[PDB]
Amino acid sequence: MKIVYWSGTGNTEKMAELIAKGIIESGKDVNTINVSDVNIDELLNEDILILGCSAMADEVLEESEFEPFIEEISTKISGKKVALFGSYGWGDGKWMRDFEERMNGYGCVVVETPLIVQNEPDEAEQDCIEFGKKIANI
Numbered sequence: 001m002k003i004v005y006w007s008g009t010g011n012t013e014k015m016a017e018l019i020a021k022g023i024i025e026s027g028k029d030v031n032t033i034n035v036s037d038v039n040i041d042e043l044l045n046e047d048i049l050i051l052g053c054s055a056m057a058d059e060v061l062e063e064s065e066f067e068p069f070i071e072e073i074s075t076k077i078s079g080k081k082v083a084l085f086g087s088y089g090w091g092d093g094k095w096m097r098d099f100e101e102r103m104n105g106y107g108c109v110v111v112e113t114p115l116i117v118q119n120e121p122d123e124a125e126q127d128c129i130e131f132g133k134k135i136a137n138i
């Protein structure tokens, strides 16, 4: 599988590595990929797209890298299974509700409840690992 994310301070990055760990512990292979190094064509071969990005102002996806990537793949992902995750600060997850709605709007099947944790995983570590285990059971 493949996990692509954007992280400004490393919070979502940590979530991505814990998610990968859960998938690996379940017996599968995963590659974590920062949005800046992703290859669209190779990404579209996946059955499951695992996407993450922290909440930027105001309750939107990061603008200079992550969103342009989402807009680029938006027309080629109809029918694909998608799993969403991300870290946030002071909000209540609105950027994630909208992120899920957008993906559904593109024709994607959102496989699980999006995983959101406030700031660094830390206490939510097992939650990150478990979310990866749910995805590996798809």
Ligand SMILES: Cc1cc2nc3c(=O)[nH]c(=O)nc-3n(C[C@H](O)[C@H](O)[C@H](O)COP(=O)(O)O)c2cc1C
Binding pocket: 006, 007, 008, 009, 010, 011, 012, 013, 053, 054, 055, 056, 057, 058, 059, 060, 087, 088, 089, 090, 091, 092, 093, 118, 119, 120
């Ligand atoms: C410029 C900026 C805007 C932010 N806007 C929001 C916001 O609208 N809602 C929220 O809950 N957190 C917001 N945050 C907080 C980040 O989502 C949060 O600190 C998160 O833990 C960052 O994860 P990352 O290191 O993976 O980027 C903002 C952070 C920055 C730097």
